[PDB]
């Protein structure tokens, strides 16, 4: 998300045990860094390997 | 510590006494507040 140019990254790492679907549980997300880019972002794209 | 002096923090301007605490805060949280929006615990960036 991007609010007033301040970009935030909320990270979370936890061990799970899945096969296909999303975990139907509950957790929290802690911030990692802070990037005051000050630009407007309208679209995005996720890269793969 | 243990003085009733003026406090000029990043987001808190007041007067209080720094006392010891037994809590365990989150590593990203820099300060803590009370229920009805009253900052009562500010961590130190130098000494953990």
UniProtKB/Swiss-Prot annotation, chain A:
Physiological role: Attaches the virion to the cell membrane by interacting with host receptor, initiating the infection. The major receptor is host ACE2. When S2/S2' has been cleaved, binding to the receptor triggers direct fusion at the cell membrane. When S2/S2' has not been cleaved, binding to the receptor results in internalization of the virus by endocytosis using host TFRC and GRM2 and leading to fusion of the virion membrane with the host endosomal membrane. Alternatively, may use NRP1/NRP2 and integrin as entry receptors.
The protein, known as: Spike protein S1
Lineage summary: Viruses, Riboviria, Orthornavirae, Pisuviricota, Pisoniviricetes
Shown residues in whole-protein numbering: 195 to 243 of 1273
Taxonomic superkingdom: Viruses
Outcome of swapping residue 19 to G: In strain: Omicron/BA.2, Omicron/BA.2.12.1, Omicron/BA.2.75, Omicron/BA.4, Omicron/BA.5, Omicron/BQ.1.1
Effect of residue 28 to V: In strain: 20A.EU1
Gene behind the chain: S
Subunit and interaction comment: Binds to host ACE2. RBD also interacts with the N-linked glycan on 'Asn-90' of ACE2. Cleavage of S generates a polybasic C-terminal sequence on S1 that binds to host Neuropilin-1 (NRP1) and Neuropilin-2 (NRP2) receptors. Interacts with host integrin alpha-5/beta-1 (ITGA5:ITGB1) and with ACE2 in complex with integrin alpha-5/beta-1 (ITGA5:ITGB1). May interact via cytoplasmic c-terminus with M protein. May interact (via N-terminus) with host bilirubin and biliverdin, thereby preventing antibody binding to the SARS-CoV-2 spike NTD via an allosteric mechanism.
Effect of residue 16 to V: In strain: Omicron/BA.2.75
Glycosylated residues in this chain: 40
């Amino acid at each position: 998300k991007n609010i007033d140019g301040y970009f935030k990254i909320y990270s979370k790492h936890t061990p799970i045990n899945l096969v296909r679907d999303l975990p139907q549980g509950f957790s929290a997300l802690e911030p990692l860094v802070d990037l005051p880019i000050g630009i407007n972002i309208t679209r995005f794209q996720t890269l793969l390997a | 510590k243990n003085k009733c002096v003026n406090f000029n923090f990043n987001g808190l301007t007041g007067t209080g006494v720094l006392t010891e605490s037994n809590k365990k805060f989150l590593p990203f949280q820099q300060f803590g507040r009370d229920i009805a929006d009253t900052t009562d615990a500010v961590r130190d960036p130098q000494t953990l």
